[PDB]
Design a protein around this ligand. Structure first.
Ligand SMILES: N[C@@H](Cc1c[nH]c2ccccc12)C(=O)O
Ligand SMILES: N[C@@H](Cc1c[nH]c2ccccc12)C(=O)O
Ligand SMILES: [Mg+2]
Ligand SMILES: [Mg+2]
Ligand SMILES: [Mn+2]
Ligand SMILES: [Mn+2]
Ligand SMILES: [Mn+2]
Ligand SMILES: [Mn+2]
Lengths: 310, 310
């Protein structure tokens, strides 16, 4: 009785790693019929991880029905609007995630395992351990990347103390130096020249349903804010097209400096006041600086989730 | 930083056991400041368990604000309408449960641990084991009861294979014979003479939000269906009062024979067709027989959840 295992739309290092990693555990521990698949082309960062360990990027799926499957397992997400296209007409078997919970419901009791930690991979790893399954080296690689990717080499305000031992142990199992491998994959994600302003606002974006509204929050990684601020024009022309065509209410863009841990916010839409409220700032020409922010999940989502209700 | 730990409204053996059991683990494993409390007077069954092991029933709480607490941990439930009165203005720290998920959302990532097993207590026990904490005898007692109560001495279609070892091991730790203690507590819950038809429809009931509707599903334990069917009149007079006063759309009552594993369904409301659909049966005089049903969570909820949508 076949089961797909996947990450969210616009899939990322953590999203792919955790998902793939686990389809393996499930088979070996409980002899389930799990096949890890994904909902998109890997990003430039994941590409590098995938090629660095010589794993093939997981095939891209359309809908469960297309695969003739009714039962799934979600990793790194749970919000129905972020999931596979036909998530309403399937059974969720199990969820392994590290996000807040919204727009998620079921008919029957499932397995869930959510912990608030720096990645969804740190959990899958910990779970490999509870069931005495040895991690192949190459999954130790993916999993690790997942954790580096998500935490920005263990310095995001999402890094939990539980992550640190997890780091040592994985790096070792992968045969890389942590400090040394970390920078060189993180670099691979800051190359934004291969991307047109259309694709750019959509390397890493998610839809949120705040209080009636569809708000779409996107993030990019860079070493220099003004590179993207020099592309402001097209970037905005692209953003507008998205809001019209998709029926978003607003769009929010985090231009994160991973070297200094800051972001610039670029936002347009009908609810600008709701945005400024969430950030105690002023959009000068559609944007503003936000000092020390790198986490969408801890420094963006909760705040919007509040000022859109208030 | 104080944290309440509790079961659902109309609290039961599993609801109290699991909740109490865990407030202990949390303290001893992670030194949290958890105090187990509950939202009602124990039922006649739990009473017997509580007195059999000499534990005091947990104080009854009004609202978190009344206790000056903002952070909670839910066991044996998750549906906001089944929880403490002010669950919207608190932070959910963690959830340990074995039900489907609905009407549940958060602002931040939490701990969840849901598994589909015969009780929420079988999970707390298993969890005591992952963290090398010895269970006091008397918590081994509560936990066990929780699992017996919920499964009807391991014969409900909710008993998982994972429950059986859990049973042996707990019974032993409690110093009771499983077969022998099981019947004598289960008996304690079938005494429905101490209850007026008002209280009767509300020993064990939960509200469900199916597709706009408020449907309220109640269950009783008996050794003889016709005892309750002989009380039909008042029982119905009481039911009506509930539907008017609360603004339910319909009421459903499972008259479960725990000796033979059957239930009689007694239902009134605006959506009778939606009910009959879910059960392939005909209400003769507001009721009908349903052969082999004992589980609200596996044989009632999913079916309504479907015919109310269909
Ligand atoms: N078959 C697995 C199911 C499971 C356990 N934990 C999970 C977490 C997520 C998804 C599925 C699971 C088991 O017996 O343990
Ligand atoms: N403080 C606990 C938190 C926790 C783990 N599992 C949980 C399940 C439910 C609620 C809380 C928890 C820990 O460090 O592990
Ligand atoms: Mg991310
Ligand atoms: Mg029950
Ligand atoms: Mn992710
Ligand atoms: Mn992640
Ligand atoms: Mn319960
Ligand atoms: Mn229960």
């Amino acid at each position: 009785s076949k089961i797909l295992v996947f990450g969210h739309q616009n899939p990322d290092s953590d999203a792919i790693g955790s998902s793939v990693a686990f389809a393996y555990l499930a088979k070996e521990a409980w002899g389930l019929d799990t096949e890890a698949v994904a909902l998109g082309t890997p990003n430039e960062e994941t590409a590098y991880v995938l090629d660095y360990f010589g794993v093939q990027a997981p095939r891209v799926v359309e809908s469960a029905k297309a695969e003739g499957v009714e039962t799934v397992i979600l990793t790194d997400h749970n919000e129905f609007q972020q999931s596979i296209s036909d998530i309403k007409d399937v059974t969720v078997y199990g969820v392994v995630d590290h996000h807040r919970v919204a727009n998620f419901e079921t008919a029957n009791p499932l397995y869930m395992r959510l912990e608030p930690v720096g990645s969804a991979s740190s959990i899958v790893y910990r779970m490999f351990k509870e069931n005495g399954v040895s991690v192949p080296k190459e999954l130790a690689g993916l999993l690790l990347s997942g954790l580096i990717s998500d935490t920005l080499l263990l310095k995001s305000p999402t890094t939990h103390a539980s992550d640190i031992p997890v780091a040592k142990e994985l790096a070792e199992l992968a045969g890389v130096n942590l400090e040394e491998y970390g920078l060189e994959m993180l670099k691979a994600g800051t190359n934004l020249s291969s991307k047109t302003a259309a694709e750019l606002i959509d390397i890493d974006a998610k839809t949120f349903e705040l209080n009636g509204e569809a708000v779409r929050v996107a993030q990019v990684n860079t070493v220099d804010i003004n590179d993207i601020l020099a592309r402001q024009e097209e970037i905005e022309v692209a953003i507008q097209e998205a809001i019209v065509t998709e029926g978003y209410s607003d769009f929010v863009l985090m231009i994160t400096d991973i070297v200094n841990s800051n972001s610039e916010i670029l936002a347009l839409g009908s609810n600008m006041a709701k945005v400024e409220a969430a950030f105690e700032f002023t959009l000068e020409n559609n944007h503003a600086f936000l000092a020390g922010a790198v986490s969408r999940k801890k420094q963006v989502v909760p705040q919007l989730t509040e000022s859109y209700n208030a």
